[PDB]
Amino acid sequence: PRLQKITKKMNLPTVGGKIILSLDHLLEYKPNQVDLFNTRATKTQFESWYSAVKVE
Amino acid sequence: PRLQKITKKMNLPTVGGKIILSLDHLLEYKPNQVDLFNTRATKTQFESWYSAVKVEYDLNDEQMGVIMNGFMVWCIDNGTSPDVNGVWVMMDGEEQVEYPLKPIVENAKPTLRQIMHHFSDAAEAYIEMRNSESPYMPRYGLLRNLRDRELARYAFDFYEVTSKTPNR
Amino acid sequence: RQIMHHFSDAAEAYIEMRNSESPYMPRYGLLRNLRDRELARYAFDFYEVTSKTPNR
Amino acid sequence: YDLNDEQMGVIMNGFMVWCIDNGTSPDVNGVWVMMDGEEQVEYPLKPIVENAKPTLRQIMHHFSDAAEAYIEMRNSESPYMPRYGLLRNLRDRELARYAFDFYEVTSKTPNR
Amino acid sequence: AREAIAQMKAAALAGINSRLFGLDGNISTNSENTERHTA
RNA sequence: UUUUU
RNA sequence: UUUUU
RNA sequence: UUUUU
RNA sequence: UUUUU
RNA sequence: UUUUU
């Protein structure tokens, strides 16, 4: 017998008596960690830096 | 022969010679402990925070579950304090779809962490599985240089102590 | 607290049974990090010493 | 686990063998596993521990004769020994019967 | 051999003090000033 | 978060 | 209680 | 005696 | 459990 | 009583 890590019966937020906020679709949400920090710039700023430099 | 734990003949308060104050109906009074602290917000403030936010993004749709989820992971990997500015971000695929940052903070009735102690077991299980596959650690830990890879479970700004934790 | 020393045995028995079922501990203790699960009985702001307590 | 079915007997049984071959203490993390065929069907680890009202071993002294007979027959076929023993280097192959974290003394045991 | 292995593992580990903490990043040698200057 | 020539 | 970027 | 969030 | 150059 | 990875 098999099952998944998270279960609906886990304790979770309860704004409404019925509706749950954290929708259980996290089993496939695996972004590369380093892309998410604040200490790195954005994908945007890196792009414009590469474009603005080329003109000058 | 059987009986109950408390008994009327126990020593108790005696305002009147007859009447007792603590009515013996405590044998069934077992609230979940963590719901009673002061370090957590109220059920009310959590609700209004969830309602007031929805207007200022102007969604009115169940995409809110994603946005909320997109906040907590970022809420791990950087600090939580009122002195944040700029933006925040979740990603999908390979791009860097960003958002604003102000209205989550300023429409937080008490401070931020005073709300976010609710999320204890969610992020716990999250880093558990990501640690299962690959060797994960947040930034709040790497900034303070733990050697034991095993105690990533207990590295957050927001984490609510209980009577369940071990003594390590 | 000068009033609330009356409540000594009440809260004592209270945390006794809740410790009987499940592993209970207050906040006044967890803020000061006891290791012995057994001495939850003696963790309060308000607790009135007597000649009855043990020497531990 | 949200089973509500009599597969629980298997899961319980799948725990005790693993409970032998590694230590029992509150400072465990990660996962645990039983196997079927050749794969490594795993499970989580937290809720068994944290929803244990007193400590873990304080529950698991019930299992005394079960695991006893288990290692008895596996020792009958082949030369079995747990990890709790091999970590402490017994020479007598015969006393595998008395190698556990959880084992409840009685008035029945011998004086050896 | 079960004896000899354990002798190796114990001989090759001594003096190593675990010290699960490394170093903290937050420094405050002197608090932030927050004052002005004029002529 | 900034501040490492 | 607050104060952990 | 006070002072334990 | 980690820590064996 | 706890503390055996």
D46 touches chain B (CB under 8 A): yes
CB atoms inside a 10 Å sphere around CB B99: 15
A11 touches chain D (CB under 8 A): no
The per-residue DSSP string of B6-48 comes to S-TTS----SSSS--SS-S-GGG----GGGG-SSS--HHHHHH
CB-based contact B166 D46, cutoff 8 Å: no
Flag residues 39-98 of B with CB < 7 Å from strand G.
Answer: 39, 78-84
Distance (Å, whole) CA B21 – CA B9:
14
D27 touches chain C (CB under 8 A): no
Under a CB-based contact definition with an 8 Å cutoff, are residues B32 and B162 in contact? no
Q: Which H or E element spans position D43?
A: strand D42-43
Q: Which amino acid is at D33?
A: V
Q: What is the resolution of this structure in A?
A: 4.0
Locus of tokens 């009202």:
D53
DSSP state of D60: H
Rounded to the nearest angstrom, the minimum Cα separation between E1 and chain D is 10
Under a CB-based contact definition with an 8 Å cutoff, are residues D13 and D7 in contact? no
How would you classify the pairing of strands D42-43 and B87-89?
unpaired
Under a CB-based contact definition with an 8 Å cutoff, are residues B155 and B126 in contact? no
Q: Which H or E element spans position B164?
A: none
The per-residue DSSP string of B52-116 comes to HHHHHHT--STTHHHHHHHHHHHHHHS---S---SEEE--STT---EEE-HHHHHT-SS-SHHHH
Grouping H, G, I as helix, E, B as strand and the rest as coil, residue E21 is: strand
How would you classify the pairing of strands B87-89 and B98-100?
antiparallel
Distance (Å, whole) CA B74 – CA B103:
16
Those residues whose beta carbons lie under 7 A from strand H are: B 38; C 1-2, 28, 31, 45
CB atoms inside a 10 Å sphere around CB B12: 16
